[PDB]
Amino acid sequence: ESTPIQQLLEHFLRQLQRKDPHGFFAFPVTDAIAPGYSMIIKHPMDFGTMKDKIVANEYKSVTEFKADFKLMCDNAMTYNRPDTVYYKLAKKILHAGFKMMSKERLLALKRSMS
Ligand SMILES: CC(=O)c1cc(-c2ccccc2)c2ncccn12
């Protein structure tokens, strides 16, 4: 079934999803739920899509995965007002991921791979 990089990335995704227990980031945002979204946000992303990409083996590196994670958070902070739940939760997730996938963390991981 899986490869080592796929397992690492599924680990990171599970930990990130735990901060969103209601699933606001689980599926794509549509124009029905968010008026005019498709005008304002050109490159949509969500946790469901990221999971599908991991399973299809579309990510070559943690860099590539981290870039989709930050796009998802930036989209939500661009579209939604600061006072909203969606904005506040996107900021919470963004911090968690930057900490979880820091250069310091990945260095330690790379040292344990000898
Ligand atoms: C992630 C996001 O921007 C989002 C999720 C939702 C959302 C809310 C309830 C149920 C499903 C998604 C939403 N609603 C209005 C404006 C923005 N959003």
Q: Residue 44's closest CA among 55, 31, 56?
A: 31
Structure tokens at 109: 């991981």
Question: What was the elucidation method?
Answer: X-ray
Structure tokens at 2: 């899986």
Q: Which residues of 23-52 are buried (b: 16+ CB within 10 A; e: fewer)?
A: ebbeeebeeeeeeebeeebeeebbbeebbe
Beta strands in 5-95 (DSSP E): none
For ligand 1, atom 7: residue with the closest CA = 24
Q: Is the CB of 47 under 6 A from ligand 1?
A: no
- Mention every residue, 6+ apart, whose C-beta is less than 8 A from residue 97: 12, 16, 66, 69, 70, 73
Structure tokens at 81: 């007002």
What's CA 26's distance to the chain center, in Å? 10
- Tokens 């397992």 sit at which residue? 7
For ligand 1, atom 5: residue with the closest CA = 24
CA 58 to centroid of ligand 1, rounded, Å: 26
The data reach a resolution, in angstroms, of 1.8
Q: Is the CB of 37 under 6 A from ligand 1?
A: no
Q: Tell me how far CA of residue 100 lies from CA of 29, 39, 61, 84, 112, in angstroms.
A: 25, 32, 15, 25, 16
